[PDB]
Symmetry: none
Subunit: 284 residues, 4 copies
């Protein structure tokens, strides 16, 4: 309740702040009207911004103030890349979804060709945004290297590739873990890592922050699997463990993430990031 | 063919050297066998490597030696990205091509889903490669900013978007110029720009090199347009011959080549700059 | 999972056999055609028969085989009563639902007047069915007393009354627990108790079976709450009071208490028979 | 006709004795305060208690003494059930009556939701009360079977269903008889039958007592119809609506005599004279 209140208050302040410059920035950085419209359509489709929120919360836990002119573009680059991944997932060549959050998918509204390009434009634009501001070049290059590693053919795209190939194969849990670590864990790992980079986290604290990020990313996926199964499915936690076992796995993972945060030296740090586990106390 | 002795020697030295590490590098940087197979299929499909060759020629022309462990990944990032653009161009959602250079396109071999992912993987890996070696961080960030600007929604992707929207439209030449400058011009501009970054070109030399690069990118497209009309494989309304006629298209090519050579003549003469100038000999102005 | 397969097999064998005589029996016991049609419509509306299945499982775990001529009407009396509750719940005067199971509710098809009467008819018929066969009268009277107590103004109806009174109120969890024990717990407690009566359970074993029944009924409600929330109303639910994580922790803890209760039974066959019912929560629905 | 002094004496003894424990018993057996308030309001609305009076009169006519701790709950279960039927009858879904005895109905007072539940509560509680005391289980089971058969979808509920179905239909008398026998006849039959069960009446006496019970149930309905017409659409579906007031009164007179004749099959006693006197509730000069 009180830890829940803290997260909801953080989202209430930051989500509108993060969203506000989006339409203007995407348009500024585009030279085709329709492409800008397609990219903006999907970015502004009411996402919770969990990933850049984790980055901001990490920065704040380290005592580093968010300066909009320096940090907004690099922090939101992650959200552009996350959006591109949804646009491509929905494509006729991929999941072939007509709706998402009860609203037409990008290719329904713009055609599959323009949708593919809108995803390509956002992926590319993410890297321009990482390197667009007055940040030390060391920080800029570290963010680029971390994001590309998370998002690329050893991370997110590898996860998506494994998902396509596993559509008709019941995977064992061990392989499903690797798939999830790539497909969804990597960007959540990066979201916290991006805060460590921008906030210049003391080296000794990196493992605790990243253990937390890994547990949170795992929890996120178990939770997503449970919601998907309950709302309506074999390559899912409930598919492998049953619904009770999947909830136990979610609870255990939450606890392991909370234990990781005890490794941090101050209670204010511990409390700052611990509030994110209350994300799983509500629904979507 | 007008390809001269300098260009062929440069190509003979560089193409095998640029190609040799590719398969192993893509495999090392991948965590899925099929994805890695799909990316590698399209990367190793006999591309002439024009863009990274230009970056190397630019570097040499600045007196800076190519060091594989420092420069190979960053120089070849551009080739990964160029490859992704061909993969996505060929998709059923885009140009729907079954063949490229008489061999099956990526989606034909791997399916449209895997092809889409292969392109996404290559585009992302290009940014990993730019930042993968022990170059100064200022230089790494400059490359990333330049490549993202050249390839994204103000550059290559904007060009492709305009291309989709122009399928059944007869564009005025003024508008075709903007489409070309985005679609093919931007990456060829970047190719030389990356050489200026890696070679730490003095600021006073940037205008001549980039005027050269812009003329080169334009000549590339006009020559491609001419080839589209004068040659048969192993509608054309939005091409230079479509707008100007074949003779007019060839005159535009010849003028553009000369403009590029004149730009380079603004820099001191050297054998390395002669090598860079010899890139114009790719364009046979006697086919028309 | 073998435990999951064991429950599914039980359901696959027993649900069609329990369902088969319903249409004819209700018609035989009615003297109005439209009433008979309204009552049968709701009873035949695809329920999983959880409550009579628990009665059958309980009685047979005690060594008493289900005999259709003796046991079918008294066992299915619980289902008629469960159906009445759904019908009245759906009424315009109550929740006002146009749909259930992706199908029109009784009042949409028959009108709110006939739907109210169909509920009244099913509640009354349940008591006729308890006493309609040749079971020993001691058993008949015990079933009646247990069912009336479970369903009445200290049981299910009291739970429904609390539910109406709590529409726009944030109940403390302690009051929600009472509401649940009444509205859904009591009939699930009865489902097992009816099995004890029909199965002539030794007195020493009543506490373990009824502790199981109480745990199962509580788990059932927490699970139903989770499903509802995941698929102002939401505040008076376990996820509303504890968060979704706390509600799932409570479901797991309650399952474990229920399994622990069963460990007090003297044979593995009894233990295993009833433990399979916790597999109900391992799947979605 | 005059009320018999026997009946006055009987009602004066028994009505307050039957009423006295009601409020405390309903409260004891409930676990929600408003529900308990809703049920008790309707039960204590001043009813004549005709049905449980008949049960007690039947019991005394068999030489069996009413003991409150053994008989009160089972006898009054019938009154609970009768009350539920009035509550549900007055509902918006049903007759939509806002008044009964010139004062608030349950739904007007508590809301249609809580009124519906108070009816459900009283119906269920009736079965708890039949089985709540130290009577032989054979006797308890027989009462439950008889009550549920009288009250359910072949009895009272079937009659209520036919009634709401007959709202704007001019029924023939032959069909009106069926509706009556279900809607009001069945509980009045059961009222005497419960006395036969509780009093362990020998089997040879059942026909005379149940013929009396059926005539009594019929006379009750004819008289209620007469009362409806003689003081202040639906008045169409009444005895005087079908037969006129004289014809209805002839039906009443003949039915009273039929019931008295039925009892005359049994040995004469003061207690049977008390039971027979129940017909003097019906004033055969009310039409005049």
């Amino acid at each position: 309740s009180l830890i829940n209140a803290r997260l909801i208050a953080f989202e209430d302040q930051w989500v509108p702040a993060l969203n506000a410059p989006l339409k203007q920035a995407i348009l500024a950085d585009s030279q085709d009207a329709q492409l800008a419209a397609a990219m903006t359509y999907s970015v502004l489709a009411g996402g919770k911004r969990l990933r850049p929120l984790l980055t901001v919360a990490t920065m704040q836990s380290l005592g580093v103030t968010f300066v909009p002119e320096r940090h907004w573009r690099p922090v939101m680059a992650l959200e552009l890349l996350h959006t591109y991944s949804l646009i491509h997932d929905d494509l006729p060549a991929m999941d072939n979804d007509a709706l998402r959050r009860g609203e037409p998918t990008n290719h329904v509204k713009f055609g599959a060709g323009m949708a593919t390009l809108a995803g390509d434009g956002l992926l590319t634009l993410a890297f321009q945004w990482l390197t667009a501001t007055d940040l030390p070049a060391t920080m800029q290059a570290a963010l680029v290297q971390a994001l590309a590693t998370a998002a690329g053919p050893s991370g997110m795209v590898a996860g998506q590739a494994k998902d396509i190939q596993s559509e008709h194969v019941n995977l064992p849990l061990s392989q499903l873990r690797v798939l999830h670590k790539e497909k969804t864990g990597a960007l959540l790992h990066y979201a916290v890592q991006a805060g460590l980079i921008l906030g210049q986290a003391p080296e000794a604290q990196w493992p605790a922050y990243l253990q937390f990020a890994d547990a949170f990313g795992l929890a996120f996926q178990i939770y997503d699997d449970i919601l998907d199964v309950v709302s309506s499915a074999k390559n899912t936690y409930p598919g492998k463990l049953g619904l009770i076992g999947a909830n136990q796995a979610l609870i255990d993972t939450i606890h392991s993430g909370q234990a990781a945060l005890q490794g941090l030296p101050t209670s204010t740090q511990r409390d700052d990031l611990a509030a994110f586990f209350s994300y799983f106390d509500t629904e979507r």
